[PDB]
Amino acid sequence: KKRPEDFKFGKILGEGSFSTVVLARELATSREYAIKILEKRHIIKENKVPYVTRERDVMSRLDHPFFVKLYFTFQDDEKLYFGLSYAKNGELLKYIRKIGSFDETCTRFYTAEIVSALEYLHGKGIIHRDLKPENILLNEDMHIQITDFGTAKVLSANSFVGTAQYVSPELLTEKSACKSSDLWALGCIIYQLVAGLPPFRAGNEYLIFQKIIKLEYDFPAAFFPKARDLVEKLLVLDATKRLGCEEMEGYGPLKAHPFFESVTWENLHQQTPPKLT
Ligand SMILES: O=C(N[C@@H](COc1ccc2[nH]c(=O)[nH]c2c1)c1ccccc1)c1cccn(Cc2ccc(F)c(F)c2)c1=O
């Protein structure tokens, strides 16, 4: 049974959807956690506060090596506290910024872990809706840990959530999001690992939505050819035609794409990740 003073609170790690996430070390153990802090004053009708407003949440307990996990809960007079996994190596976006772009072996390995993670998440009937490199964290061992910041939803129009660069055309034009929306976001992320920047770029968010809906993007000359082929099979306007979706026979043909030829799917979490250089 813990409380605020078993901990030293340190740097802010993230924010959003009514809460702050703070690095904290447990004094007895020296162990480090990311503590989501939520002010009780925020818990009202006009607000959708994540994880608290939900009758049923099966996300709270999500427990898989490629996702952030919940370790403990406690409260004080004004706030609630949720002890989450701390991903010591920060955001994948930070490595894309540091090294400019990833080589093919690193793109293949990290893309396969995101695919693996998605397969699991979608098999649990959950969709993320805001998948992007800022939400793909790296633990101390350099494996991914995906985080939700309030957009993930159990499948039982849809809320206008997400980040403009990664949002699907079906969310924009049909108000709908499905498993296949996170597969569109996976195509933007693969592009961004290879090219160094995401594929839909424009002067403002409205202009970026216009490029998404028209499929206006291009590949640099050096983009790895099998990766270009995979991205072309994910960035398809018709959501029922993306590789990986149920109507395309599911995750088997996505994992069987030539870009993943030397991948061993079964044990990615037990493989030593390639050095990022
Ligand atoms: O509470 C969970 N996530 C937090 C964010 O947690 C963070 C944020 C940054 C950090 N940096 C770091 O090192 N550790 C950090 C932890 C949240 C905040 C605000 C609203 C909603 C959620 C949270 C609680 C339980 C499980 N998961 C993982 C998850 C659930 C559903 C999904 F679809 C999914 F893809 C993943 C959480 O993200």
Side-chain angles (χ1 to χ4, degrees):
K1 183 61 313 209
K2 313 160 196 293
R3 44 203 219 13
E5 290 102 318
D6 306 336
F7 296 99
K8 189 166 81 150
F9 282 112
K11 78 176 203 241
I12 286 46
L13 295 166
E15 277 214 67
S17 334
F18 301 104
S19 76
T20 304
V21 179
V22 181
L23 178 58
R25 173 196 316 287
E26 190 165 63
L27 302 171
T29 44
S30 229
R31 275 216 186 103
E32 278 179 303
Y33 297 95
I35 292 180
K36 174 176 142 192
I37 316 312
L38 162 65
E39 315 182 78
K40 290 176 172 180
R41 82 148 152 96
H42 277 131
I43 303 169
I44 47 158
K45 217 324 286 313
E46 35 273 275
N47 305 26
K48 262 113 283 178
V49 177
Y51 286 75
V52 159
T53 283
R54 311 317 291 168
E55 280 241 355
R56 71 270 105 182
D57 61 1
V58 303
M59 272 162 211
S60 254
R61 300 173 268 110
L62 183 77
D63 186 359
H64 178 284
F66 295 152
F67 298 89
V68 148
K69 175 181 168 191
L70 176 73
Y71 295 89
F72 58 72
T73 61
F74 67 81
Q75 99 200 97
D76 80 352
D77 307 73
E78 32 259 328
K79 294 179 317 213
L80 305 168
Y81 306 78
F82 309 82
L84 304 173
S85 322
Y86 164 57
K88 186 161 190 313
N89 281 309
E91 305 180 355
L92 187 68
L93 177 57
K94 168 182 82 149
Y95 292 86
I96 297 170
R97 298 271 182 65
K98 184 203 201 169
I99 67 176
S101 66
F102 277 25
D103 70 20
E104 183 161 7
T105 293
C106 294
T107 295
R108 178 167 69 238
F109 179 81
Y110 282 111
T111 292
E113 289 206 333
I114 291 168
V115 165
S116 177
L118 281 186
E119 181 177 15
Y120 179 76
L121 191 68
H122 289 171
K124 303 296 265 207
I126 297 168
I127 56 170
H128 194 288
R129 304 192 301 174
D130 202 15
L131 192 72
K132 47 173 184 192
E134 293 88 305
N135 283 331
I136 292 166
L137 308 174
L138 288 167
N139 60 34
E140 51 176 18
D141 282 323
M142 289 303 288
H143 289 281
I144 69 168
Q145 282 188 287
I146 294 171
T147 196
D148 175 37
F149 250 106
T151 58
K153 179 169 186 161
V154 186
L155 291 174
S156 39
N158 299 94
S159 300
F160 195 61
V161 300
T163 293
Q165 290 184 127
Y166 314 85
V167 73
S168 58
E170 63 268 18
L171 180 67
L172 298 170
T173 65
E174 298 193 348
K175 316 186 285 309
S176 72
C178 52
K179 290 174 182 182
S180 191
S181 314
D182 286 335
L183 295 171
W184 172 279
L186 163 74
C188 289
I189 295 155
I190 291 170
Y191 183 105
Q192 184 175 2
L193 301 181
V194 177
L197 291 172
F200 305 102
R201 312 187 300 272
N204 74 24
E205 288 83 339
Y206 169 79
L207 295 168
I208 285 172
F209 291 156
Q210 289 295 292
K211 289 199 178 174
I212 287 166
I213 69 106
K214 288 180 203 153
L215 204 59
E216 296 186 348
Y217 77 106
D218 314 285
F219 294 92
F223 199 100
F224 312 127
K226 287 181 177 181
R228 168 173 181 149
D229 193 72
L230 176 52
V231 170
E232 296 206 70
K233 293 175 163 44
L234 291 169
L235 298 190
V236 180
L237 290 174
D238 181 345
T240 70
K241 308 265 184 277
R242 304 185 181 130
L243 190 63
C245 81
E246 344 210 66
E247 296 86 359
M248 287 295 284
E249 292 283 68
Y251 277 85
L254 171 58
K255 289 164 48 191
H257 189 277
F259 181 63
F260 296 126
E261 178 222 287
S262 61
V263 171
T264 294
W265 293 97
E266 301 71 8
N267 70 349
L268 284 169
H269 68 299
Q270 299 172 338
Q271 291 164 41
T272 307
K275 195 147 234 310
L276 293 175
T277 203

